[PDB]
Design a protein around this nucleic acid. Structure first.
Ligand SMILES: Cc1cn([C@H]2C[C@H](O)[C@@H](COP(=O)(O)OP(=O)(O)OP(=O)(O)O)O2)c(=O)[nH]c1=O
Ligand SMILES: [Ca+2]
Ligand SMILES: [Ca+2]
Ligand SMILES: [Ca+2]
Length: 1118
DNA sequence: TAACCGCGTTC
DNA sequence: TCTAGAACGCGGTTA
C-alpha cells in the first residue's frame, strides 16, 4: 500500500527525471564543503548559481521513498539545472494536559510505529492561549515522517482517537469515583501542502537567485533582475460542425500558431488547409513585432510531431495559452492519442487532478486565468479580443467561428492571418502583463508560477499570512468549519451575514460644467469649516503632505483666500452657478479601516479574556424560518418514519442512516413548506446591533501583513498617478513620448489593480470557507465603520453642495464653482504641496472623529512593555472636476438607481461607465448599441433643454427603427441588434423547476442541434423573443437564433412547434419578432436615462413617444 | 404587489 | 478539492 503507492509516485518521479533531463534539467549536486554556512562567503562556497523558475514536490530514493522538492534553475551561462531538497513532513499533536505530554509521547511513539520516523517536543505561540502575550507558549508533539504517504497514514490512525475522545466514554464500573489516548486534544498543521511547507520553512521563493551549495540554498542578493526564460505562446484552431462546438473525437486541428521569444511560427494541416501558406508578417503595432515562419505539413499527425519536436528543440520553461487548459491542451492530447502518440513521452505535459495541463520543467501560463482573477475587467470584456484592445492597445483580427471551417478551403490565407493574430496577442499579453506580475509575486508567495497564477486570491492571502505566522513562531489555526445548522431565537437559520456597504442614490439627471445649478448652502456649516480651517490646513501640511508649517511660506495667503471664499458663501446662501463635478473616495478603504483600528481575527475577544479593549460595533443580519423548535422537531420525527433511496444490494435507507447533511436538506425542504402554510412566510430577516472587543495588544501579524501589502499596492498606485501627470506634461505633438507615457499608465494601473484584489481579499478572507483566521465580527466592524465614515462625509457635502451618488467609501457630488477648490503651498525649497480643500476638509474631520487612540505596540519585547499611540490611515482621495455626469432614474416612484452612471472628462472623453448593459456581458444588443450611441450626446446642447433635445433625436431615431418593425435595417444588422446573449453558469440539467429565457433557449438548442450542445457549462444562449404563442409567458417564446440559419425544413418544424401554429409558412425573423416586446425594452431604457431624469430637472418630456409613468403624470399635474 | 432567483455588475 | 466579502439592477417567475 504505502510502499506500493510509493510505486506510482516513485515511478512518476523517474519519468519526470527523464523528461527533465531531456529538456535540460539534470539533477545537480553541489560539491562538499567543510567550512561555515555564512552567506557573506557566497563566492567562496562551492556551488552553482541559478535563477529559480519552478519547484515541485517529488519522491527520491536513497525501501520507501524520501519526500523532497525539485527546484528548477536557469544558470548564468545560458543553461539550466535542477536541485533537490529533502525535508521530513511533519504535523503537531496538541495536549489538553501540559504536564502529561510525555505520556502521550510514549503512546503515539508505540501507536504510530508503522509510519513515525521521529518525534520531538516543541513550543509555539498560541494566540488563543491565556498569558501568551506574557511569553507563555503551547507545548506540542512534533511528528516527523519520511514522506507524505506516511504522514497521511498517521492521520488515518489518529482520527479514530480524536473521534473517540469527542464522543462519550464507555461506562464499566458505575460506582468507580485518564488513559493516554484521551489527552490528545487535536492535531495541528496537518493539511499544509508539502511544497508550501518546504518553501516556507526553508525560505525559498521562485523568482529569486540562489547558489545551490551543500549546506543549502544561499540567496544571491547581488543578482538583481530575472533571468530571461524561453517563452512560447501558442493557439490552436480546429474544424467544427455547422452551428455547433468542436469534438476532439472527430474534428481535426487545422493549424497551430505560436511565438517563441518573439519569433513567430505556424504549422498547418494541409489535409484541411487548401494552399501551402507562405511566410507573412502581422505586426499589429510596432511594439509587437510579428514575423511568422510557416511549417506546412501533410497530415494532422505530422502537425503534432512538428509542434512536439519544436518544443523539444527550444526547450521552453514557460508555455502560455489563452484558455488552453480547457480547450487547446485537451484537444492536442485527444488528437495525439487517436494518432498513437503519448504526449507525456513527447513533451512531458499531462492533465493533473483538476484536469489542467501541467509539466515538471515548464510552467503553463493560461492568460485567461490572469484575466479572470487580476484584470478587474468586466466579464463582457474577458475575451482575448477585448483584452487585447484594453491591454495591448489595438484591434486583433476577427472571424466568425462559423466561417473558420469553410475558410480553411475557400480563403486559407485569411484563416492564417487570424490564427497568428490570436498568437501575437497571447505572447505579448503574457510578456507585458502576466509574466512580470506572476513571477514577481512568486518572490513573496511560496507557490510556483502555475499555482500563483491559478489559486484564489483568498488562498494567496492565506499563503502570505502563514509565512508571517511561521516566522513569528505562531501556531497555525486549523481550517474553519461551518456548523451544519445554526439557530436564532429557536428558529433554524437559513443564512446569516453582516450589513455591508452603504449605498445611496440621491439625485438623477444631467450635470455639466457649463450648465448652472441651484445650491442652498448651510451657513452653520460654513461656520464649522471656518472654525476648523486653521487646524485642517495644518493637518493638510503636517499629515497629508508629511511636512511642517514652519517650511511653508504662504500658509496665511492660502488661509485668507479660502476664508474669503467661505465667507462669501455664508453671506449668499442661495446661489445658481456652474458646478464642480467632483468624486471623493477613501483610498484602500476597508484595509485602512482594518489597519487603523488594529482589526484582525485574533484581536476579537469574548469578554472572558481581555484601555486595552477597543469596543467596536457591527450589524448582524440573519435569515431564519418562522417555525419554532416545537415545529422543527415535528417535521424531523415525521421524516424519521419515512424511507429514503440508497446511494447505489440495499435499496432503501432510514433517515437516521443518512448523512447529517442530507438530513438537514430534507428538514429544510419540509420546514419551508410548513411555514408557507402555517406562517405564509418562508424567510424572516432581522438586524441586530452587536458589539465586539478588539484587543489592541494582540500579536499584530495579521494587521502587519495587511499594512505591508497595502504599501506594496500604493507603490504602483502612486506610479500610475505619477505617469498620469507625466502624460499631461508632454506636448501633444510628440507622439512617441505620449505613447510611452500611456503605456506606463496602463501597466501601472494594471499592476495596482491586481494588487488591489489580493489586498482587499485580506478583508474577505476572514469570512472565507476553510479560513484559518475566520471572524464575522471583524468583517462586520469594517463595514459598519466605513458606513459611518461615508455618511459623515455625505452629511457635510449636503450642507455645502449636492451629493449625487454614494457607494461604500465614495461620493459623487457637485459643488458651487465658488467653493474653495485647489491651492498650492509654496515651500522654502521651492517645492510645492498640493491642497484640495474639499478633500482636506473631509480628511480633517475623518481624523477628528475616527482616529484610533488606543493603538498599542511592543516597545520592549524582552520585558513585555507596550506603548500606546494614535493611528489613522483613512484618507479620502479626490478626482475631478469633470465635464459631465449623467445619472439615470427609476421607473418606480420615490426610488432611484444605484451603481449606474456615466462621467465625461473635460476633453470630452469617457471617464467612467458603471453598471449599464453596454458593459455587462450579454444583455439585449439593442439596448447596448442605444446606450453606446446616447451617452456622448449628453455633452451636446447649449442649455439643459437643448441637451435633452439633442439626446431625444438619437432616441427617436432608435424608436423609429423599432416602430418600423425592422424594415429600415438590413438583414445582418437586424440579427445582431435584436439578439440577446446570456450565459448559463451551470448546465441545463442543473436548472430543474426553473423558467428562464436561457433555459428555454437551451432546451430548444438541444431539441434541434442535439444534446451535445448542452453537455458543458457556460453555454451562450443567443435568442430572440417571438410573438408566436400570444399572451404566453416570455420564457416560453424564446427561440434560439441559430434556428434561422439551418435549412428551411428544420426551421418550419421547430418554429411551428415553438409558435404553436402548425399553419405557419412565413419564416422571416421580422415576422417572428415581437417588436412590441423590444419597443417596451427600448422605452424602458429611454425612460430611465432620458425622460424621467428630465422630468426631475423640470424638463417636459423630450421624447413624447415614450409616455411618462402615470405616477409622474399625476405629479406633473400638481 | 411583494417575495424570490440567475447573472453580472459596483463597491 | 478548492473555495475572499456584501449591495444592487433588471428581467423574469411565483405566492
Ligand atoms: C473592488 C473591491 C472592493 N472591496 C471592498 C473593500 C474596499 O476597501 C471597498 C471599497 O472599494 P474600492 O473603493 O473600489 O476599493 P479600495 O478603496 O480598496 O481601493 P481604491 O484605493 O482604488 O479606492 O470595497 C472588496 O471587498 N472587493 C473588491 O473587489
Ligand atoms: Ca484562438
Ligand atoms: Ca479610487
Ligand atoms: Ca476606495
Amino acid at each position: 500500500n504505502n510502499y506500493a503507492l510509493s510505486a506510482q509516485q516513485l515511478l512518476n518521479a523517474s519519468k519526470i527525471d527523464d523528461i527533465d533531463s531531456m529538456m535540460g534539467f539534470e539533477r545537480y549536486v553541489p560539491p562538499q564543503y567543510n567550512g561555515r554556512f555564512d552567506a557573506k562567503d557566497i563566492d567562496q562556497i562551492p556551488g552553482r548559481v541559478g535563477w529559480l523558475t519552478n519547484m515541485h514536490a517529488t519522491l527520491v530514493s536513497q525501501n520507501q521513498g524520501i519526500s523532497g522538492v525539485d527546484f528548477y534553475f536557469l544558470d548564468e551561462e545560458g543553461g539550466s539545472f535542477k536541485s533537490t531538497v529533502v525535508y521530513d513532513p511533519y504535523f503537531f499533536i496538541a495536549c489538553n494536559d501540559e504536564s502529561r505530554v510525555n505520556d502521550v509521547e510514549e503512546l503515539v511513539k508505540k501507536y504510530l510505529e508503522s509510519c513515525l520516523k521521529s518525534l520531538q517536543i516543541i513550543r509555539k505561540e498560541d494566540l488563543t492561549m491565556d498569558n501568551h502575550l506574557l511569553g507563555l507558549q503551547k507545548t506540542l508533539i512534533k511528528l516527523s515522517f519520511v514522506n507524505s504517504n506516511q504522514l497521511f497514514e498517521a492521520r488515518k490512525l489518529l482520527r479514530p482517537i480524536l473521534q473517540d475522545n469527542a464522543n462519550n466514554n464507555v461506562q464499566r464500573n458505575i460506582y468507580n469515583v485518564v488513559d493516554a489516548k484521551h489527552l490528545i486534544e487535536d492535531i495541528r498543521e496537518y493539511d499544509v501542502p508539502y511544497h508550501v511547507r518546504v518553501s516556507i520553512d526553508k525560505d525559498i521563493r521562485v523568482g529569486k537567485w540562489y547558489k545551490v551549495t551543500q549546506q543549502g540554498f544561499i540567496e544571491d542578493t547581488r543578482k538583481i533582475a530575472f533571468a530571461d526564460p524561453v517563452v512560447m505562446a501558442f493557439d490552436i484552431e480546429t474544424t467544427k460542425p455547422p452551428l455547433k462546438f468542436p469534438d476532439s473525437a472527430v474534428d481535426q486541428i487545422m493549424m497551430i500558431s505560436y511565438m517563441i521569444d518573439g519569433e513567430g511560427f505556424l504549422i498547418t494541416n494541409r489535409e484541411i488547409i487548401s494552399e501551402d501558406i507562405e511566410d507573412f508578417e502581422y505586426t499589429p503595432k510596432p511594439e509587437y513585432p510579428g514575423f511568422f515562419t510557416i511549417f506546412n505539413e501533410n497530415d494532422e499527425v505530422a502537425l503534432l510531431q512538428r509542434f512536439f519536436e519544436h518544443i523539444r528543440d527550444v526547450r521552453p520553461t514557460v508555455i502560455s495559452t489563452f484558455n488552453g487548459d480547457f480547450f487547446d491542451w485537451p484537444f492536442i492530447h485527444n488528437r495525439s492519442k487517436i494518432h498513437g502518440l503519448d504526449m507525456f513521452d513527447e513533451i512531458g505535459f499531462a492533465p493533473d487532478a483538476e484536469g489542467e495541463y501541467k509539466s515538471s520543467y515548464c510552467s503553463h501560463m493560461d492568460c485567461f486565468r490572469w484575466v479572470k482573477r487580476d484584470s478587474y475587467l468586466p466579464q463582457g470584456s474577458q475575451g482575448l479580443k477585448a483584452v487585447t484592445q484594453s491591454k495591448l492597445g489595438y484591434n486583433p483580427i476577427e472571424l466568425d467561428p462559423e466561417l473558420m471551417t469553410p475558410y480553411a478551403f475557400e480563403k486559407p490565407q485569411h484563416l492564417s492571418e487570424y490564427s497568428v493574430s490570436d498568437a501575437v496577442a497571447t505572447y505579448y499579453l503574457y510578456m507585458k502583463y502576466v509574466h512580470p506580475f506572476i513571477f514577481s509575486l512568486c518572490t513573496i508567495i511560496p507557490l510556483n508560477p502555475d499555482e500563483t497564477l491559478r489559486k484564489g486570491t483568498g488562498t494567496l492571502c492565506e499563503m502570505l499570512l502563514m509565512v508571517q505566522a511561521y516566522q513569528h513562531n505562531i501556531l497555525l489555526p486549523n481550517k474553519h468549519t461551518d456548523p451544519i445548522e445554526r439557530f436564532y431565537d429557536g428558529h433554524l437559520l437559513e443564512s446569516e451575514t453582516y450589513v455591508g456597504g452603504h449605498v445611496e442614490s440621491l439625485e438623477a439627471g444631467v450635470f455639466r460644467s457649463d450648465l448652472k445649478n441651484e445650491f442652498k448652502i448651510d451657513p452653520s456649516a460654513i461656520d464649522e469649516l471656518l472654525q476648523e480651517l486653521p487646524e485642517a490646513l495644518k493637518f493638510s501640511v503636517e499629515v497629508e503632505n508629511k511636512s511642517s508649517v514652519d517650511k511653508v511660506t504662504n500658509f496665511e495667503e492660502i488661509k485668507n483666500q479660502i476664508t474669503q471664499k467661505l465667507l462669501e458663501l455664508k453671506e449668499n446662501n442661495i446661489r445658481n452657478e456652474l458646478p464642480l463635478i467632483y468624486h471623493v473616495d477613501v483610498a484602500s478603504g476597508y484595509p485602512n479601516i482594518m489597519t487603523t483600528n488594529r482589526l484582525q481575527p485574533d484581536s476579537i475577544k469574548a469578554e472572558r479574556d481581555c484601555t486595552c479593549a477597543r469596543k467596536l460595533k457591527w450589524a448582524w443580519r440573519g435569515e431564519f424560518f418562522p417555525s419554532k423548535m416545537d415545529e422543527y422537531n415535528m417535521i424531523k420525527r415525521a421524516l424519521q418514519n419515512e424511507t429514503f433511496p440508497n446511494k447505489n444490494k440495499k435499496k432503501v435507507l432510514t433517515f437516521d442512516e443518512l448523512s447529517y447533511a442530507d438530513q438537514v436538506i430534507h428538514i429544510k425542504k419540509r420546514l419551508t413548506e410548513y411555514s408557507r402554510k402555517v406562517y405564509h412566510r418562508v424567510k424572516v430577516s432581522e438586524i441586530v446591533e452587536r458589539e465586539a472587543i478588539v484587543c489592541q495588544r494582540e500579536n499584530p501579524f495579521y494587521v502587519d501583513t495587511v499594512k505591508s501589502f497595502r504599501d506594496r499596492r500604493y507603490e504602483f498606485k502612486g506610479l500610475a498617478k505619477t505617469w498620469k501627470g507625466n502624460l499631461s506634461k508632454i506636448d501633444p505633438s510628440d507622439k512617441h513620448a505620449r505613447d510611452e507615457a500611456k503605456k506606463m499608465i496602463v501597466l501601472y494601473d494594471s499592476l495596482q489593480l491586481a494588487h488591489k484584489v489580493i489586498l482587499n481579499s485580506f478583508y474577505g478572507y476572514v469570512m472565507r470557507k476553510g479560513s484559518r483566521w475566520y471572524s464575522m465580527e471583524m468583517a462586520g466592524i469594517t463595514c459598519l465603520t466605513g458606513a459611518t465614515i461615508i455618511q459623515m462625509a455625505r452629511a457635510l457635502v449636503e450642507r455645502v453642495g449636492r451629493p449625487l451618488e454614494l457607494d461604500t467609501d465614495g461620493i459623487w457630488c457637485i459643488l458651487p464653482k465658488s467653493f474653495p477648490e485647489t491651492y498650492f503651498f509654496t515651500l522654502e525649497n521651492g517645492k510645492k504641496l498640493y491642497l484640495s480643500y474639499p478633500c482636506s476638509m473631509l480628511n480633517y474631520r475623518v481624523h477628528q472623529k475616527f482616529t484610533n487612540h488606543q493603538y498599542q505596540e511592543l516597545k520592549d519585547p524582552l520585558n513585555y512593555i507596550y506603548e500606546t499611540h494614535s493611528e489613522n490611515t483613512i484618507f479620502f482621495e479626490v478626482d475631478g472636476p469633470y465635464k459631465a455626469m449623467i445619472l439615470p432614474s427609476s421607473k418606480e416612484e420615490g426610488k432611484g438607481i444605484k451603481k449606474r452612471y456615466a462621467v465625461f472628462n473635460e476633453d470630452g472623453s469617457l471617464a467612467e461607465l458603471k453598471g449599464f448593459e453596454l458593459k455587462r456581458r450579454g444583455e439585449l444588443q439593442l439596448i447596448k448599441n442605444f446606450q453606446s450611441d446616447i451617452f456622448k450626446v449628453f455633452l451636446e446642447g447649449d442649455t439643459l433643454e437643448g441637451c435633452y433635445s439633442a439626446v431625444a433625436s438619437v432616441c427617436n431615431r432608435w424608436l423609429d427603427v423599432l416602430d418600423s418593425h425592422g424594415l429600415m435595417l438590413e438583414d445582418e444588422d437586424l440579427v445582431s441588434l435584436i439578439c440577446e446573449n446570456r450565459s448559463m453558469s451551470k448546465t441545463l440539467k442543473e436548472y430543474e423547476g426553473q423558467k428562464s429565457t436561457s433555459i428555454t433557449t437551451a432546451r430548444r438548442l438541444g431539441d434541434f442541434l442535439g444534446e451535445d450542445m448542452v453537455k458543458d457549462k457556460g453555454l451562450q444562449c443567443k435568442y430572440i423573443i417571438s410573438s408566436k404563442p400570444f399572451n404566453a409567458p416570455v420564457t416560453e417564446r424564446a427561440i434560439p437564433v441559430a434556428i434561422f440559419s439551418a435549412d428551411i425544413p428544420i426551421k418550419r418544424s421547430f418554429l411551428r412547434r415553438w409558435t404553436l401554429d402548425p399553419s405557419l409558412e412565413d419564416l422571416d425573423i421580422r415576422t417572428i419578432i415581437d417588436w412590441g416586446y423590444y419597443r417596451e425594452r427600448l422605452g424602458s431604457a429611454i425612460q430611465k436615462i432620458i425622460t424621467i431624469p428630465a422630468a426631475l430637472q423640470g424638463v417636459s418630456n423630450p421624447v413624447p413617444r415614450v409616455e411618462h409613468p402615470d405616477w409622474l403624470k399625476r405629479k406633473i399635474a400638481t
